[PDB]
């Protein structure tokens, strides 16, 4: 999708705001929150849960393209503009930075705003799934991640989303360089640089916590999302989390990876097996009452793991990860997937899966397909908000 609808994006944001408010606005969770990757998907939902679910002041970092009078910007630009407008209306502090989250300049700008505008400290640092290209600070060398298996070719049933057909799709295995570079991009190195910088600047509150988002997914995609090159990066991420946890614990806080569920995203839409699995699991989970989108995931993370009213510590897996893919990875859900997977064809795709839902949710990312938006009305693409351009 090559265009976006600003008002649609605003209504998406308003829908998430309403959803978290409906779960109860709390005042005993985070107060000063930094979200790295704050403009879309899980990052955006985390910002909305923090601000509108917990009344927190927020600073978001993202890389998007601003709109001009004649050309639409990216969805994340309009999402963030909507967030800012409504957060300010709600009397909250809301500031944003548009630029490269991997860069030292982004860290410096964040630190300056925390010191000068936010009261001097943050108590929660959210680290969203990073971009797949990383310019290294100092050297300027650019590393690129690879979503490839290791050791052999990966082949799986998939959807050609341009034709609404079932295909077989294959991915060739990673080189050693691709494995290393994927660790460099999708591992924990930059997350640790952020915590380093914040600590060094004295802007981490006593008790500050950090959470980095991750994903494991289903058995049919294990060779690429759980194992493979990305899997090696996740090992690095998980290792980093436990290192950061010990570090922040010395000051009363902690750190965790939170493994989240499968949801429609721009990134995985490009990987043909994923629209198929997502479509399938959406249908199965909706029937079982277990379906969640980004805002439900983040509300459950905040309310049932990080800031439990019963004051108890969050439950974790063997690697000290928070798991919000708990409902998805139930035997009943996954077994139902296993039963349907071999049956799917072009002729029955829409009937065996929620592929209609997938297509709707994909267009929704960009602000299209809502039932409460007049898409015939004029669109103003030049939208300004409180955002520093690096």
Author numbering: 12 to 401
Copied sentences from the primary study:
We successfully crystallised the full-length selenomethionine-substituted xoFabV (SeMet-xoFabV) without removing the N-terminal His tag and the thrombin cleavage site. The crystals diffracted to 1.6 Å resolution under synchrotron illumination. The SeMet-xoFabV crystal contains one monomer in the asymmetric unit. The density map was of high quality and allowed us to build an almost complete model containing 390 residues (C12-L401) but lacking the His tag and thrombin cleavage site at the N-terminus and A402. Each xoFabV monomer consists of 13 α-helices (α1 – α13) and 11 β-strands (β1 – β11). Strands β1 – β4 and β9 – 11 form a parallel β-sheet located at the centre of the structure. This β-sheet is flanked on one side by helices α2, α3 and α10 and on the other by helices α4 – α7, which, taken together, constitute the canonical Rossmann fold centre. Unlike the strands constituting the β-sheet, strands β5 – β6 and β7 – β8 form two anti-parallel hairpin structures. Structural comparison showed that the locations of the conserved tyrosine and lysine residues in the Y-X8-K motif of xoFabV and the Y-X6-K motif of ecFabI were notably similar, despite the fact that there are two more residues in the former than the latter. In xoFabV, Y236 does not point to K245, and the distance is 10.4 Å.
In particular, enoyl-ACP reductase, which catalyses the last reduction reaction in the fatty acid elongation cycle using trans-2-acyl-ACP as the substrate in an NAD(P)H-dependent manner, is a vital enzyme and, therefore, is a promising antimicrobial target. FabV is the most newly discovered class of ENR. It exists in a variety of organisms, including some clinically important pathogens and serious plant pathogens, such as Vibrio cholerae, Yersinia pestis, Pseudomonas aeruginosa, Burkholderia species and Xanthomonas species. Here, we report the whole structure of xoFabV from X. oryzae, a serious pathogen that causes blight disease in rice, and we identify the key active residues involved in the reductase activity.
